Design an enzyme around this catalytic site. Structure first.
Site, PDB file in Angstrom:
ATOM      1  N   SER A   1       0.767  -1.214  -0.053  1.00 37.93           N
ATOM      2  CA  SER A   1       0.061   0.012   0.106  1.00 37.93           C
ATOM      3  C   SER A   1       0.892   1.306  -0.020  1.00 37.93           C
ATOM      4  O   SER A   1       0.589   2.291  -0.655  1.00 37.93           O
ATOM      5  CB  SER A   1      -0.953   0.076   1.183  1.00 37.93           C
ATOM      6  OG  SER A   1      -0.368   0.707   2.220  1.00 37.93           O
TER       7      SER A   1
ATOM      8  N   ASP B   1     -10.897   1.066  -4.251  1.00 37.93           N
ATOM      9  CA  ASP B   1      -9.945   1.575  -3.399  1.00 37.93           C
ATOM     10  C   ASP B   1      -9.828   3.216  -3.708  1.00 37.93           C
ATOM     11  O   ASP B   1     -10.009   3.719  -4.950  1.00 37.93           O
ATOM     12  CB  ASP B   1      -8.424   1.251  -3.788  1.00 37.93           C
ATOM     13  CG  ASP B   1      -8.611  -0.370  -4.052  1.00 37.93           C
ATOM     14  OD1 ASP B   1      -9.289  -1.134  -3.235  1.00 37.93           O
ATOM     15  OD2 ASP B   1      -7.492  -0.839  -4.888  1.00 37.93           O
TER      16      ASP B   1
ATOM     17  N   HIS C   1      -8.647  -2.390   0.093  1.00 38.66           N
ATOM     18  CA  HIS C   1      -7.179  -2.420  -0.207  1.00 38.66           C
ATOM     19  C   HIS C   1      -6.600  -2.499   1.205  1.00 38.66           C
ATOM     20  O   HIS C   1      -7.062  -1.788   1.960  1.00 38.66           O
ATOM     21  CB  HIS C   1      -6.802  -1.067  -0.906  1.00 38.66           C
ATOM     22  CG  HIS C   1      -6.199   0.114  -0.161  1.00 38.66           C
ATOM     23  ND1 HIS C   1      -7.124   0.845   0.592  1.00 38.66           N
ATOM     24  CD2 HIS C   1      -4.943   0.734   0.174  1.00 38.66           C
ATOM     25  CE1 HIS C   1      -6.623   1.764   1.182  1.00 38.66           C
ATOM     26  NE2 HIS C   1      -5.275   1.603   1.125  1.00 38.66           N
TER      27      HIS C   1
END
Lengths: 576, 576
Positions: free
Chosen positions: B394, B517, B547
């Site tokens: 991420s 996301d 996500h």
């Protein structure tokens, strides 16, 4: 014999390996530690030999090595094999002093404590063996001498099994779960005493042995049903299989009509569960794979408390376990839903009332009422009733036996099968070789079963040769009320010491247990007391697992094959 | 049209069924509920049609329908399908009034709120698209009016996506975990404010939407590394594969030398990572399946902070994620161990320094130093350095662009491939149609990633037609400081607005992402800025998942193959 000598023949050289290359304290520490290791192995060999010989002399059948003596010998040889492997590794890897002496010093010190404590326990098992008559794994003595024996054994101190060595007798694939369960239970104990320690395992024992003798059953009442609160009960259900019918019921608190098999034209009426406090709602709950014929109608839809599958063949009754004090029916689904995938039976998982606020006979009559209601309201439960099966759990195995045997005293058609997994069938307090390993188990201390029968029954609030002295529990002598009123010596509460003439009409029994439970000698006496009568009972024992593995199937591979072992033996009831 | 008309044809009878069969308040409630449902569907249909037409007009390739417009259209369509199925069931099962009208009343009013709020969001998307130039997924405006747009977004109220309907856009198998997660955040928030919510989901939003706008970055520094503590990491580590090499390292805080691939005869020395506070230990930790050749010697064993596998072909670098503020290298193991099962390369899961106490360039050059040290000390890590494969998360999904391309500015050889799972590549604060649905996501709201860039940067502390008045957030205007100094314009913080001439020498990139996301519009913008230059970049999109799922691989049946997709595209780098 080759395992004991191998530690001894690597002793003096490893004593000379460290004592000749340094005058510090650690040389003396390691030399004394390894001398203690060889001394403990050499002194523990003959007692283990006598124990295994008489353990061969003691077991009911050669097919099932299930005794307490085999379990204590297994624990001792597991400790010896672990010390052997550690010794072989350090001997092969002592070319440099790169490894810190403190870590292996503390490890081998803890294993010295483990070997000396198992030496004391093996000596106590030998004392029990000499004192009693061989052939019976329990004691025939009175209450006072049995209490003296139990206090004398519980006087020992357990600074090794509850520290860093938590779970040496099990599979290495399960130990982290035991450590975090220990951390969580110490966390709840500290939080509730007040109304970190996880990094250092040396201080784990300093509370894990104090909670053994400083615990209340009202406080363990939270432990079994910690899998009931609305976050974990929801979070434990992804491993559960698919379902649609998960509805509760509410039975009426009034009696009805039921016949007896001796004469179909004559019926017997039995009162609801009163227990001199008023009958209430017998709360059961139906778990079925699909909606069955005649089941999704109004007669079932009118009792929920705030295509169609055809005519079913045999419902499966279920009583939960959880020590008769916790773990209600809202917790056993993640294998109950997995039960209904292949069985194809409407599993009514009865939530009976729990001790001590609802002790016997209230705790045994509403499950007698719910079982009685389920032969006549069969279409209401989506079943037929021409064949009944049964199931049992951790504590609900004696309740699985009792409600299936007192029905034969009433003439109503009893079931033709019993499937109770590791039952608590010896609620009468007595010393036993397999109950000696109740101070060392990871999940439960000796005080779990000591205070379980206080709740159920509604109770009102040389020793050693000279020169041998391991660590002893000096933290106050615990004198608890463990008196045995005449309400505890009965089949209805403990179906071994029941009169022989009324166990003849028992259904066939299928029973499983593990080799390292306190509920092992209790279940072993069941097979011996029914194989001399002609009634067939099959006892299967498993190893490297604790008791309480049925609510733990989706955790490891060995807990998978043990909790699934209940399933294939529960369907042998289903065939005519 | 047929999906919207079918919600209208059963409206008049539904009103006539309940308003003519009772004079109570619930008749007016249900009639108003179904009138609101039909008017919301009929008024939201044309905006949805315009949004899908421009979504077809706006995407880059037909193979990957990934924008913000497709995601908002999918959210509205899923809400409409849920309401349609509920209406079908209620219409087919309205023969009696056995079901309590209050429960379906509360569910249907929650869904009415959901449709109104999604109507407001779809109108906002239409107004955005209109205002901006078509063809560009992002906005070219300055800071002031973009902040005006962001505040005009923030003043909306989100009392529907966070109540009982928390997680409708995903798979239903994932929703219970989000419910327990939401209970976790609300319990954490009330405990942290003070220094039950699983029974009433209606009161869950009334705390969750205050948590969204009343949290700190230091508060969120605990959530991602709640799996770093030893109890939860131990409780998660059994699902991982077996390992033997899991050892940390400790790099020296002194400069050393590299060659350049432009000319091997000339040399360049690293400036040590100072960040005007002094170089320290570059904490890197090695995960390998087996002990490899020349790795278990004294050189590696002299770096631990307080047979043999043959000569390895290539190593794999890894940077962790976790919003640059949490989730250090001690939380990525349970799927990192499964990486080493098939890849056959030693993972160096680099523990770089973390914002906000270590912002750029301290969080930028330590991982530059660690990557630089691994090119020369190849055998010491059990590698050869013939190929570098790189991984991302991420937050670490921009690390495989920032420090993996700045090496080409220094002349040293660059890796031959980048894998970045859902990268955060547009840290410059501005709104987009996929940043629109950052207020409805369960695991993180908009005020998580918008306040994680103040940590990284080290910052110093008609609108609507008349008559349309849904619920608006009057709980204070969140005028947080989101000023954008020129330290965010640079290439080495957000490489989309970088100068064009330097992204030409980028390594080939493989990127996975999800359709729901906030970091969706940025990842598809990354393919836009590189497909017009000739450099090949592949983008894969998945659906029905949030996500942050790489640490949640072995929990659901749909995140198993989605987190496996990261491994599938990370082995395409290894080929020559």
């Amino acid at each position: 014999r080759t395992m004991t000598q191998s530690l001894v023949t690597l002793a003096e050289d490893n004593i000379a390996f460290f004592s000749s290359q340094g005058p510090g304290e650690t040389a003396q520490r390691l030399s004394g530690v390894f001398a203690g290791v060889r001394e403990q192995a050499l002194g523990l060999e003959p007692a283990l030999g006598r124990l295994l010989g008489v353990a061969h002399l003691f077991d009911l059948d050669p097919e099932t090595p299930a005794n307490g003596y085999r379990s204590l010998v297994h624990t001792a040889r597991c400790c010896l094999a672990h010390l052997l492997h550690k010794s072989r590794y350090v001997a092969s890897n002592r070319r440099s002093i790169f490894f810190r002496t403190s870590h292996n010093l503390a490890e081998l010190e803890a294993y010295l404590a483990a070997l000396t404590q198992l030496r004391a326990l093996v000596y106590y098992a030998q004392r029990l063996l000499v004192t009693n008559r061989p052939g019976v794994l329990f004691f025939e003595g009175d209450e006072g001498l049995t209490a003296d024996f139990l206090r004398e054994y519980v006087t020992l101190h357990k600074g090794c099994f509850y520290g860093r060595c938590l779970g040496f007798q099990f599979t290495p694939a399960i130990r982290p779960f035991l450590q975090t369960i220990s951390i969580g239970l110490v966390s709840f104990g500290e939080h509730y005493k007040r109304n970190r320690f996880a990094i250092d395992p040396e201080l784990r024992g300093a509370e894990f042995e104090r909670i053994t003798q400083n615990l209340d059953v009202h406080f363990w009442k939270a432990f079994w049903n910690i899998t009931e609160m609305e976050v974990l009960s929801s979070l434990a259900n992804m491993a559960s299989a698919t379902v649609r019918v998960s509805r509760l019921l509410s039975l009426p608190p009034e009696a009805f009509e039921m016949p007896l098999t001796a004469d179909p034209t004559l019926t017997v009426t039995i009162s609801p569960p009163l227990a001199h406090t008023g009958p209430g709602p017998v709360l059961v709950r139906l778990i079925s794979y699909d909606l069955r014929e005649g089941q999704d109608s109004e007669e079932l839809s009118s009792l929920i408390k705030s295509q169609q599958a055809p005519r079913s063949r045999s419902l499966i009754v279920h009583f939960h376990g959880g020590g008769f004090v916790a773990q209600t029916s809202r917790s056993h689904e993640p294998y109950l839903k997995s039960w209904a995938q292949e069985l194809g039976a409407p599993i009514i998982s009865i939530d009976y009332s729990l001790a001590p606020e609802a002790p016997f006979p209230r705790a045994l009559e509403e499950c007698f009422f719910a079982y009685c209601w389920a032969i006549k309201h069969c279409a209401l439960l989506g079943s037929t009733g021409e064949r009944i099966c049964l199931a049992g759990d951790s504590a609900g195995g004696n309740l699985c036996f009792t409600v299936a045997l007192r029905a034969a005293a009433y003439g109503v058609r009893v079931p033709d099968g019993i499937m109770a997994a590791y039952p608590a069938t010896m609620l009468q307090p007595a010393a036993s070789p397999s109950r000696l390993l109740s101070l060392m188990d990871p999940l439960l201390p000796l005080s779990v079963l000591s205070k379980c029968v206080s709740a159920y029954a509604g109770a009102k609030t040389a020793a050693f040769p000279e020169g041998f002295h391991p660590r002893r529990s000096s933290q106050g002598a615990t004198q608890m009320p463990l008196y045995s009123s005449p309400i505890v010596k009965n089949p209805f509460m403990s179906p071994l010491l029941a009169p022989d003439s009324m166990l003849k009409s028992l259904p066939p029994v299928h029973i499983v247990a593990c080799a390292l439970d306190p509920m092992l000698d209790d279940s072993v006496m069941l097979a011996r007391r029914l194989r001399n009568l002609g009634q067939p009972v099959t006892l299967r024992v498993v190893e490297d697992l604790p008791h309480g593995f049925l609510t733990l199937a989706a955790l490891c591979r060995e807990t998978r094959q043990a909790a699934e072992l209940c399933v294939e033996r529960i369907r042998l009831v289903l065939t005519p």
